[PDB]
Amino acid sequence: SKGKKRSGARPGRPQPLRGTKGKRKGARLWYVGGQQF
Amino acid sequence: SKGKKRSGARPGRPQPLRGTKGKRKGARLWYVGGQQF
Amino acid sequence: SNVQTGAERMPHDLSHLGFLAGQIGRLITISTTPVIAGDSFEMDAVGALRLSPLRRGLAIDSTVDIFTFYVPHRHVYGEQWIKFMKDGVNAAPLPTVNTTGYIDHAAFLGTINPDTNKIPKHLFQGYLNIYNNYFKAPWMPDRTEANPNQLNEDDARYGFRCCHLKNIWTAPLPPETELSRQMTTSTTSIDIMGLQAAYANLHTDQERDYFMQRYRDVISSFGGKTSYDADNRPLLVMRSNFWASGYDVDGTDQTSLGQFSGRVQQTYKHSVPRFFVPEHGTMFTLALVRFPPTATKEIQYLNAKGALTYTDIAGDPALYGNLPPREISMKDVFRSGDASKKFKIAEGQWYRYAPSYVSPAYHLLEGFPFIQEPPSGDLQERVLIRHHDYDQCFQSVQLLQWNSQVKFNVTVYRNLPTTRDSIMTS
Amino acid sequence: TYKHSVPRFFVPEHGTMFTLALVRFPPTATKEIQYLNAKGALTYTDIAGDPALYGNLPPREISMKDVFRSGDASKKFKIAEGQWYRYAPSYVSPAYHLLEGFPFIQE
Amino acid sequence: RCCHLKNIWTAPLPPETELSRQMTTSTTSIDIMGLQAAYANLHTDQERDYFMQ
Amino acid sequence: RCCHLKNIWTAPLPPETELSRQMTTSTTSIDIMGLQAAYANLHTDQERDYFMQ
Amino acid sequence: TYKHSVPRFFVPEHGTMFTLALVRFPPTATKEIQYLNAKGALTYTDIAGDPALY
C-alpha cells in the first residue's frame, strides 16, 4: 500500500447538491455567437 | 543519463601498487588453527 | 499562417456530480478521469451516504471505505504502448474489449454501456489490477477474464466480492501451511549436522507462507525496495474510512404506535492532495460498504470442544510457544457447523480472542444485520461476503442496499491550448 | 425567501418596466457517456494531448451516438478539438433509470 | 421556451461554421501573395461566426 | 567500437531526415485550412527525428 | 595519475556494478578542407550570411 489512511466523516445534515460544476474557473469553454443568459 | 559528470586527474608520479586489499577492515576471514605469521 | 507549437499552464475545472448505488461487500467504481504526462491532480469530494430504510431502527453501524488509485497506460497496453507513442500521429489505434448487451452491465466500471458493446481496454484491465493487488486474499488465485462479457450477473452490475473483517474463522492460516516435515535418516543412525540444515530450510518455507506470498514482500525482508513500475501494480494515492450513523422515526397511528424505523445518513469528505502525474493514465475512485461479521450461532472454542485437557486450559508458555498449529472444524465454533470443513489456527488463540454473543431470542428476526446460518462451501466461499445475507435487514427499493449523492471538486493543471486557439485558424 | 432590489432609475421617456422570472435545473441525463469511452478505437490525436495538434486543427464533427447510449447517428454537431480534456460530464448510475422524483432527462 | 445551461451538447458551435475553405489556383502554379490574402478573409468570417452575430 | 567526438562529418543529421514533404491538392483549388493542419503533422515528425528517437 | 570516486549508493535489489573505460583522440585528419574553399562557385546563399535565408 502507500499513502493515505485518512478519515472523512463530518457532522451536520446532507444538504442537497447545488451546482454541477465549479470549484475554480479557468478560461472560457463555449462560444455561441454572443450572449445568451 | 543520470548523475556523475565528474573529473579525476591528479598531479604527481604513478607510485607502484602497495598491498592488494585494505581500505577498511571488518571481521576475521580465515581460520587455520592458530597463528601463522 | 500562424502555427502554434506550445501552450501555457492553467487550471481546468473538470467537476461533476455523483448519483451512485451498490450492494454490501462489493467493490464498485465511483469516478474516473484521464490524465496526461506532466499534470497535477487534486480532488475534494463532498457527499452523503444513505442506506435503504431499515425495518426496526438503528442497532449497529457500518464502515465505509473510499480509495483513489493511479494506473499508467503502459501497465495495460505494455509493448503496444511505447510503440504507439514513438510513432506519433499515424500510429495504429489501441484495442477494445466486448461487453454483454444491456444497460446495467459494465456498471462496476462506473459507466453506462455504449450501444456498440465495446469499451477501452484500459478501463477493464485497470480494475482487475487493483483487485488482484489489494483486495483479494494473497493465497487466492488471480482473476483473468480478458472480456467483461465473460462475467456473470452481480459481477457486471455490481463489483467483485471482497473479504470480511478479520476474525477467528474469516482470517485463518493459509490452507497450505504444513503441520509436519520429515527428514530422511538411516536405519540406525542420524546426521546431526544435516538436522541443523533441515531447520533452516523449514524457516524459509514458513516465512514464504505467513508473510511473503508476493514478490514485493520478499524484497522488503532483505531491506530493499521496489517501485510500482518494477512490480507493475497500481499506486494508492489516498484512502478514507468512517462509520455511518443516523436517527429514528416514530409511528403515530393506531397500529404502528410503538414502532420505530431507522434512517442512516452521513456526511463525509474524501480529499486528495496535489499529485504529480508522471505518465499518461487514469485515476480511479472506488467505494466499499461492510458490516462487522456477527453471527447468531457462534460459540466459544473452550465451551464447544468436548473434554478439556491440560494443553487447552493451563495456558502454559512452554507449550503454546513450541507446538505446531492446530486444525479444527466448523463444528467447534458453530452450532450447526459441518464437521468436514477444516481450517488451521494458532495454539492458544482462544486466550487472545473473544467472540460476540447473540442471545437465542434474536434468531431469525428482521432488521439486525447478522449471519443467520454458518457459511457453507470451501474456504474461499466463507471468507468472501455474500450480500444475500442482508436481504431481510432492509425494505425492498429500487436503489439496492446503499446509495450516495456526491459532488467531485477536481482541478488539474495542464498544458493545453484554449478553446479559442483551437477554433481560430489564425 | 428572496429579494429583488432595483436602485433609483431616471426614466428619460415614456415607457414600460417589465419584470420576469425563469426557473431551471442543471442538465443531467441518465444515459450520457464520456467521449473517449464511447468512440471506438483510440488514435494518437484522441489520447496524446499534444499541444501542436490541438491548436492547429479544424473543429471536429460528431453525433449524438458518441455521447448517449441510445443517440441517433444521423444527428450531428461540431465541437472543438481537445474539448474532452476540458470538460467532465456527470455520472448517473444505471439503477436510477426510470425512477420517480429525481429531475433528470430520461431519454 | 429558453435554453439549457451550457454543456457539451447543449452549447455546440453554430451550425454554420465551416470545416474547410478552398482557394482557386492554376494548374501548375500558385500565387503565394494571394494565399496570404485568403487567410485574412477567413479570419474575418470566423470572427463573425463565434463572437459577432 | 564507439563514436568519434562530434564534428562536421562525424555528427551529421540522421540519415532519415526529409528534405521535402508533399500535400495532396485538387487540380485548380487548394484547401487552406488543411494546409495549416499539414504543417502541424510535419512539426511532430521533425521532433521525433532530431530529439526524440 | 587519476581517481574515480563513487559516493555511497543504496542498492535496492540484487544486481551487478560495472566499471568501464574508453580512450579517444580528437578527430583530426590530414586532408580536410573548409567547405567554402572546396565547393566550386560561390553564390549569394553561400557567402552573404543573410538571416532571412538561413
H, E, C per residue of chain C? CCCCCCCCEEEECCCEEEEEEECCCEEEEEEEEEECCCCEEEEEEEEEEEECCECCCCCCCEEEEEEEEEEECHHHHCCHHHHHHHHCCCCCCCCEEECCCCCCCCCCCCCCCCCCCEEEHHHHHHHHHHHHHHCCCCCCCCCCCCCHHHCCCCCCCCCEECECCCCCCCCCCCCCCCCCCCCCCCCCCCCHHHHHHHHHHHHHHHHHHHCCCCHHHHHHHCCCCCCHHHHCCCEEEEEEEEEECEEEEECCCCCCCCCEEEEEEEEEEEEEEEEECCCCEEEEEEEEEECCCCECCECCHHHHCCCCCHHHHCCCHHHHCCCCCEEEEHHHCECCCCCCCEEEECCCHHHCCCCCCCCHHHCCCCCCCCECCCCCCCHHHHHECCHHHHHHHECCCCCCCEEEEEEEEEEEEEECCCHHHHHCCC
Q: Which residues of A touch C47 (CB under 8 A)?
A: 14
CA angle C277, C8, C415 (to 5 degrees): 30
Question: CA-CA distance, C424 to E52, in Å (whole number)?
Answer: 14
Task: Output the DSSP codes for A1-37.
Answer: --S--EE-EE-S--PPP--SS-SS--S-----SS---
Question: CA-CA distance, C356 to D30, in Å (whole number)?
Answer: 44
CA angle D3, D4, D6 (to 5 degrees): 140
C-alpha cell at C221: 525482508
Give the up-direction half-sphere exposure of residue A29: CA atoms within 13 A in the CB hemisphere.
22
Contact F41 C89 (CB under 8 A): yes
E51 at A interface, C-beta within 8 A: yes
Name the minimum distance, in Å, from the CA of E17 to any CA of chain F: 13
CA F53 distance to own-chain centroid = 13
Residue in chain A lying closest to E13 (CA): A32
C-alpha cell at C98: 466486448
Question: CA-CA distance, B21 to C62, in Å (whole number)?
Answer: 66
Question: CA-CA distance, C248 to C259, in Å (whole number)?
Answer: 10
The one-letter code for the residue type at C267 is: T
Question: CA-CA distance, A12 to C322, in Å (whole number)?
Answer: 54
Query: CB count, 10 Å around CB of C137?
Result: 14
Sort C169 into a burial class: Cβ within 10 Å, 0-12 / 13-18 / 19+. Answer: buried
In a mutagenesis test of the E interface, which of D77, D83, D104, D105 is the best target, namely the one with the most E β-carbons within 10 Å? D77
The one-letter code for the residue type at C415 is: N
Residue among C371, C373, C355 nearest C302 (CA): C355
Residue in chain B lying closest to G5 (CA): B8
- Which helix (H) or strand (E) is C15 found in, with range? none
Contact C1 E39 (CB under 8 A): yes
Residue among C418, C390, C423 nearest C292 (CA): C390
A36 at C interface, C-beta within 8 A: no
CA angle C366, C372, C376 (to 5 degrees): 150
Residue among C375, C401, C23, C416 nearest C167 (CA): C375
Q: Which residues of A touch E9 (CB under 8 A)?
A: none
Are the C-beta atoms of residues C29 and C285 closer than 8 Å to each other?
yes
Q: Dihedral of the CA atoms C364, C367, C368, C370 (nearest 10)?
A: 50
- Our separate counts of H helices and E strands in chain C read 11, 15
- Which helix (H) or strand (E) is C382 found in, with range? helix C379-383
Q: C158: which residues sit within 8 A by CB, 6+ positions away?
A: C22, C23, C26, C28, C107, C108, C400
C-alpha cell at F26: 485538387
Are the C-beta atoms of residues C399 and C21 closer than 8 Å to each other?
yes
Last residue before each break in chain A (C–N > 2.5 Å):
none
DSSP H helical ranges for C239-370: 301-304, 310-313, 317-320
* Cα torsion D66, D68, D69, D74: sign: negative
Q: Which chains touch B (3 or more CB pairs under 8 A)?
A: G
- Which helix (H) or strand (E) is C406 found in, with range? strand C402-415
C-alpha cell at D51: 499541444
Greatest distance between any 2 Cα atoms in chain G? 64
Residue among E20, E52, F39, C417 nearest D60 (CA): E20
Question: CA-CA distance, C393 to C401, in Å (whole number)?
Answer: 10
Q: Chain G residues within 8 A (CB-CB) of chain F?
A: 22, 24, 26-27, 35
Strand spans (E) along C255-322 = 260-276, 281-290
For chains G and D, having 3+ Cβ pairs within 8 Å is answered no
**Pairing relationship of beta strands E22-24 and F29-31 according to DSSP bridges:** antiparallel
Give the up-direction half-sphere exposure of residue C70: CA atoms within 13 A in the CB hemisphere.
24
Task: Output the DSSP codes for C196-233.
Answer: HHHHHHHHHHHHHHHT-SSHHHHHHHTT----HHHHT-
Give the residues across from C67 on adjacent strands.
C239, C286
Give the residues across from C97 on adjacent strands.
C119
| SS3 of residue C328 by DSSP | strand
Are the C-beta atoms of residues C50 and C265 closer than 8 Å to each other?
yes
Contact C426 E13 (CB under 8 A): no
Method used to obtain the model: cryo-EM
Question: CA-CA distance, C45 to C272, in Å (whole number)?
Answer: 9
Q: Chain E residues within 8 A (CB-CB) of chain F?
A: 19-27, 30, 35, 38-39, 42
Which among C4, C36, C115 is the nearest to D49, CB-wise? Answer: C36
Q: C2: which residues sit within 8 A by CB, 6+ positions away?
A: C426
Q: What are phi and psi of C419, to 5 degrees?
A: -60, -35
For chains G and F, having 3+ Cβ pairs within 8 Å is answered yes
Q: G8: which residues sit within 8 A by CB, 6+ positions away?
A: none
| C-alpha pair distances (Å), D18 with each of A35, D10, D15 | 20, 15, 10
Question: CA-CA distance, C375 to C334, in Å (whole number)?
Answer: 10
Name the minimum distance, in Å, from the CA of B17 to any CA of chain G: 12
Q: Which residues of F touch C3 (CB under 8 A)?
A: 36, 39-40, 43
A vs E: CB pairs below 8 A: 21
Whose cell is 506532466? That residue is C38
Q: G2: which residues sit within 8 A by CB, 6+ positions away?
A: B8, B9, B10
In a mutagenesis test of the A interface, which of C8, C130, C274, C407 is the best target, namely the one with the most A β-carbons within 10 Å? C407
Give the residues across from C295 on adjacent strands.
C371
- Which helix (H) or strand (E) is D37 found in, with range? helix D35-38
Query: Buried b / exposed e across C47-61, counting CB within 10 Å, b at 16+?
Result: bbbbbbebbebbeee
> Interhelix angle for F32-50 vs E32-50, to 10°?
100
**Pairing relationship of beta strands D60-63 and D76-79 according to DSSP bridges:** antiparallel
Are the C-beta atoms of residues D30 and D104 closer than 8 Å to each other?
yes
Which among E21, E26, E39 is the nearest to F31, CB-wise? Answer: E21
Assign residue C90 a region: left if phi > 0, alpha if psi is -120 to 50, beta otherwise? left
Are the C-beta atoms of residues D91 and C19 closer than 8 Å to each other?
yes
Contact E35 F32 (CB under 8 A): yes
**DSSP 8-state code for residue C364:** T
Q: Which residues of C touch E43 (CB under 8 A)?
A: 424-426
Residue among C370, C361, C316, C275 nearest C33 (CA): C275
Greatest distance between any 2 Cα atoms in chain B? 52
Contact F45 C5 (CB under 8 A): no
User: If you count them, how many residues does chain E have?
Assistant: 53
Q: What are phi and psi of F39, to 5 degrees?
A: -75, -30
**DSSP 8-state code for residue C342:** E
Residue among C293, C230, C229, C272 nearest C60 (CA): C293
Contact F36 C425 (CB under 8 A): yes
Name the minimum distance, in Å, from the CA of C424 to any CA of chain D: 8
C-alpha cell at C82: 511505447
Question: CA-CA distance, C25 to C34, in Å (whole number)?
Answer: 27
Question: CA-CA distance, E31 to C391, in Å (whole number)?
Answer: 79
| C-alpha pair distances (Å), C292 with each of C24, C158, C206, C286, C356 | 12, 21, 30, 20, 10
Question: CA-CA distance, C268 to C47, in Å (whole number)?
Answer: 6
Q: Which residues of B touch G2 (CB under 8 A)?
A: 8-10
Question: CA-CA distance, E26 to E41, in Å (whole number)?
Answer: 20
Structural resolution in Å: 2.7
Q: Dihedral of the CA atoms C204, C205, C210, C216 (nearest 10)?
A: 60
Question: CA-CA distance, D28 to D90, in Å (whole number)?
Answer: 7
| C-alpha pair distances (Å), D43 with each of C120, C144, D9, D46, F20 | 12, 26, 59, 5, 26
Strand spans (E) along chain D = 60-63, 76-79, 91-92
Question: CA-CA distance, C41 to C19, in Å (whole number)?
Answer: 22
Contact A30 E52 (CB under 8 A): no
Task: Output the DSSP codes for chain F.
Answer: --PPPP-TTTS---TT--S-------SSEEEHHHHHHHHHHHHHHHHHHHT--
Alpha carbon distance, N-terminus to C-terminus of chain D: 34
Are the C-beta atoms of residues C58 and C50 closer than 8 Å to each other?
no
CA angle A18, A19, A23 (to 5 degrees): 110
Question: CA-CA distance, C161 to C289, in Å (whole number)?
Answer: 11
Contact E42 C425 (CB under 8 A): yes
Are the C-beta atoms of residues D93 and C21 closer than 8 Å to each other?
yes
Contact F5 G24 (CB under 8 A): yes
C-alpha cell at A35: 450572449
**Pairing relationship of beta strands A6-7 and C235-244 according to DSSP bridges:** parallel
Question: CA-CA distance, D45 to D82, in Å (whole number)?
Answer: 9
Residue in chain C lying closest to D79 (CA): C423
Question: CA-CA distance, E21 to D59, in Å (whole number)?
Answer: 13
The one-letter code for the residue type at C166 is: K
Contact D26 A20 (CB under 8 A): yes
Question: CA-CA distance, C110 to C108, in Å (whole number)?
Answer: 6
The one-letter code for the residue type at C78 is: G
| SS3 of residue C131 by DSSP | helix
* Cα torsion C246, C248, C249, C255: sign: positive
B vs G: CB pairs below 8 A: 14
Question: CA-CA distance, D93 to C108, in Å (whole number)?
Answer: 10
Question: CA-CA distance, C364 to C372, in Å (whole number)?
Answer: 7
Question: CA-CA distance, D36 to D85, in Å (whole number)?
Answer: 10
Residue among C426, C93, C423, C416 nearest D50 (CA): C416
Are the C-beta atoms of residues C385 and C75 closer than 8 Å to each other?
no
Q: Which residues of A touch E13 (CB under 8 A)?
A: 31
Contact F28 E30 (CB under 8 A): no
Contact D57 F37 (CB under 8 A): yes
C-alpha cell at F49: 527525428
The one-letter code for the residue type at G48 is: A
| SS3 of residue C22 by DSSP | strand
Residue among G16, B11, D49 nearest C417 (CA): D49
Residue in chain B lying closest to G1 (CA): B10
**DSSP 8-state code for residue D68:** B
- Which helix (H) or strand (E) is D47 found in, with range? helix D44-47
Question: CA-CA distance, C389 to C262, in Å (whole number)?
Answer: 19
Name the minimum distance, in Å, from the CA of D23 to any CA of chain C: 20
Q: Which residues of E touch A36 (CB under 8 A)?
A: 3, 6
Question: CA-CA distance, C383 to C373, in Å (whole number)?
Answer: 14
**DSSP 8-state code for residue C165:** P
Give the residues across from C163 on adjacent strands.
C384
Query: CB count, 10 Å around CB of C414?
Result: 24
Are the C-beta atoms of residues D53 and D45 closer than 8 Å to each other?
yes
Question: CA-CA distance, C394 to C402, in Å (whole number)?
Answer: 10
Query: CB count, 10 Å around CB of D12?
Result: 6
Question: CA-CA distance, C357 to C30, in Å (whole number)?
Answer: 36
Which among A10, A26, A31 is the nearest to C423, CB-wise? Answer: A31
C-alpha cell at C45: 469530494
Sort D63 into a burial class: Cβ within 10 Å, 0-12 / 13-18 / 19+. Answer: middle
C-alpha cell at D29: 441525463
Give the residues across from C118 on adjacent strands.
C98
Contact D53 F40 (CB under 8 A): yes
Q: What are phi and psi of D63, to 5 degrees?
A: -125, 175
Q: Which residues of A touch E53 (CB under 8 A)?
A: 33-34
Contact D69 C112 (CB under 8 A): yes
Question: CA-CA distance, C411 to C273, in Å (whole number)?
Answer: 11
Question: CA-CA distance, C425 to D73, in Å (whole number)?
Answer: 28
Question: CA-CA distance, C254 to C49, in Å (whole number)?
Answer: 33
C vs E: CB pairs below 8 A: 16
Q: Chain F residues within 8 A (CB-CB) of chain G?
A: 2, 4-5, 7-8, 10
Are the C-beta atoms of residues D69 and C103 closer than 8 Å to each other?
yes
Residue in chain F lying closest to E34 (CA): F32
Task: Output the DSSP codes for E1-53.
Answer: --PPPP-TTTS---TT--S--EEE--SS---HHHHHHHHHHHHHHHHHHHT--
Name the minimum distance, in Å, from the CA of D86 to any CA of chain F: 21
Question: CA-CA distance, C6 to D52, in Å (whole number)?
Answer: 6
